[PDB]
PDB file of C-alpha atoms and ligand atoms in Angstrom:
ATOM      1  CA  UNK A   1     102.346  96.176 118.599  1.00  0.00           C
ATOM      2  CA  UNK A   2     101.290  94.171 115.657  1.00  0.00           C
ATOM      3  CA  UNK A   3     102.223  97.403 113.534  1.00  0.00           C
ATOM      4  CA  UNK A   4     104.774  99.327 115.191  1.00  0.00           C
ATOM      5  CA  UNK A   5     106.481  96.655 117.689  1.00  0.00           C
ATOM      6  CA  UNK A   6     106.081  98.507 121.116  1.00  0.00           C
ATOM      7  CA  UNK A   7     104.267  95.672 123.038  1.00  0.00           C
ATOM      8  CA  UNK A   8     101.003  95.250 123.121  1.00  0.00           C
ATOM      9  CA  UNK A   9      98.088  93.170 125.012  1.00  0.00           C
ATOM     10  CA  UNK A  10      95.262  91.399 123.948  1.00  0.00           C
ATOM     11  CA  UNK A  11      92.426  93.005 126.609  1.00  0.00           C
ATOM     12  CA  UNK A  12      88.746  94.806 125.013  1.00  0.00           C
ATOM     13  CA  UNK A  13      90.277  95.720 121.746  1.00  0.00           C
ATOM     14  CA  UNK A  14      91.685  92.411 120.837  1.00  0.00           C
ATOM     15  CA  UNK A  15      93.771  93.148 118.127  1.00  0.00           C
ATOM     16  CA  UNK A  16      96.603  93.894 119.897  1.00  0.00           C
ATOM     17  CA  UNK A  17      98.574  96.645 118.677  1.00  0.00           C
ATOM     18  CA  UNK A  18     100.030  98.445 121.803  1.00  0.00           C
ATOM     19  CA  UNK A  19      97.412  99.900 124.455  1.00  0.00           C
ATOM     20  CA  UNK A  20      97.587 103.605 122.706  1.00  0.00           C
ATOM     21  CA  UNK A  21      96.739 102.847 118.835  1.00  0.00           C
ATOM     22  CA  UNK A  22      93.765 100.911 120.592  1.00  0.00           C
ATOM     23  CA  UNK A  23      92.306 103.778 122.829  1.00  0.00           C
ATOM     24  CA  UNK A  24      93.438 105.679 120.190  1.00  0.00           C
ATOM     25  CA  UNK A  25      91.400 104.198 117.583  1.00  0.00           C
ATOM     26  CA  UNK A  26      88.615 104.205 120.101  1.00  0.00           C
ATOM     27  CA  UNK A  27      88.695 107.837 120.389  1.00  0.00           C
ATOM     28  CA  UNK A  28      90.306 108.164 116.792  1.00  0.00           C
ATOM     29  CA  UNK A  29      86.949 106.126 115.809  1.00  0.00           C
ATOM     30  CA  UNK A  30      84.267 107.948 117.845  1.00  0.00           C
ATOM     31  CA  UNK A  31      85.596 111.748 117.084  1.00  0.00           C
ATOM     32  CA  UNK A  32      88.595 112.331 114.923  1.00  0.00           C
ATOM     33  CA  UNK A  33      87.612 109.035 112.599  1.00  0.00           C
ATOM     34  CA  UNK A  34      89.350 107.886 109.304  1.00  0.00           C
ATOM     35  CA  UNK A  35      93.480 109.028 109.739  1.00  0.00           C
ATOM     36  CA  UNK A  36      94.175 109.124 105.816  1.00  0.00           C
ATOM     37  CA  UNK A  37      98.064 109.232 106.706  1.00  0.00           C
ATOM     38  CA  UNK A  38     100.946 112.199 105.163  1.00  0.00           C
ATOM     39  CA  UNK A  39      99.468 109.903 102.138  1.00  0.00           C
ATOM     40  CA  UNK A  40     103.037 109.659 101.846  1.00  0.00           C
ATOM     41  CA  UNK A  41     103.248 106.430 100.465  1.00  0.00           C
ATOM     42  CA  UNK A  42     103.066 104.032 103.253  1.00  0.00           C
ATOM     43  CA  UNK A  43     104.651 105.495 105.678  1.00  0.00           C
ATOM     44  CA  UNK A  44     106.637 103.481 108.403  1.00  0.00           C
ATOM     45  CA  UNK A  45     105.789 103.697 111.868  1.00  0.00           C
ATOM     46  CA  UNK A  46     107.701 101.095 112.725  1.00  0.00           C
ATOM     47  CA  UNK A  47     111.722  99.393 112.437  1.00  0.00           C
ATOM     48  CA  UNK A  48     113.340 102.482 114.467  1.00  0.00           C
ATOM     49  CA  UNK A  49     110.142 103.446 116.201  1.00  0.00           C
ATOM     50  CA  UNK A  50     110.060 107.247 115.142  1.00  0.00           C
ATOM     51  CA  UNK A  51     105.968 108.486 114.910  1.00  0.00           C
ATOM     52  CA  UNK A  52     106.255 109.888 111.270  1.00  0.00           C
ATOM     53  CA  UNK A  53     103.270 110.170 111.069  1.00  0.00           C
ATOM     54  CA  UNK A  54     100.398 109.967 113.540  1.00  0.00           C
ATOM     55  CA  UNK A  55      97.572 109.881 110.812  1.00  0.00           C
ATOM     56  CA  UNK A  56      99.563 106.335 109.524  1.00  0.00           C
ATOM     57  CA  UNK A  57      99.714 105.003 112.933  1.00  0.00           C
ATOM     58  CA  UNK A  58      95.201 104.419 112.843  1.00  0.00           C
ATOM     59  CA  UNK A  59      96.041 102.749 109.049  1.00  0.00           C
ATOM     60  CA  UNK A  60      98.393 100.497 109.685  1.00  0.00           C
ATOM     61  CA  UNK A  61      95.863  99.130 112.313  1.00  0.00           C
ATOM     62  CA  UNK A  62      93.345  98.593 110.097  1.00  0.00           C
ATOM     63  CA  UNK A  63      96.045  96.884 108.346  1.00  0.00           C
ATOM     64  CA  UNK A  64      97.493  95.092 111.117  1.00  0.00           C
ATOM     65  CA  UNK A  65      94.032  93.977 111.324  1.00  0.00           C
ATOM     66  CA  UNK A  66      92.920  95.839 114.525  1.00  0.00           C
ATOM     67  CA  UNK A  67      89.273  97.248 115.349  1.00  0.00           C
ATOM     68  CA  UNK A  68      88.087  98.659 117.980  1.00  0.00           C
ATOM     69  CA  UNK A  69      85.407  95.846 118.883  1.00  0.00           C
ATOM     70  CA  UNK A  70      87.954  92.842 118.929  1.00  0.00           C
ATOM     71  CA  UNK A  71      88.141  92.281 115.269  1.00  0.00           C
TER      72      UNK A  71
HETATM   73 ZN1  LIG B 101     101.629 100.567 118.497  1.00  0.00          ZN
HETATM   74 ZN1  LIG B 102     101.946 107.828 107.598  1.00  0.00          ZN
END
């Protein structure tokens, strides 16, 4: 993971962030879309590896620089 560290691969969605924040943001995208974090001012879901907050997770791949069609 580009974001959070937990390995990732390359595959459909690229950007490789691990497999989850991918299918994730593929389901994330199509139904529950935009996750606006805790806004609790960039939160950290990474270092320790503790999911703070799930909503942060879908940012910080936009961030990363991950979209769903290969970005
Ligand atoms: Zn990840
Ligand atoms: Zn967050």
């Amino acid at each position: 993971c580009l974001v959070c560290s937990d390995e990732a691969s390359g595959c459909h969605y690229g950007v490789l962030t691990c497999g989850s924040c991918k299918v994730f943001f593929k389901r994330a995208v199509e139904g529950q879309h935009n996750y606006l974090c805790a806004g609790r001012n960039d939160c950290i879901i990474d270092k320790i590896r503790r999911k703070n907050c799930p909503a942060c997770r879908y940012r910080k791949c936009l961030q990363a620089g991950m979209n769903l069609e290969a970005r």
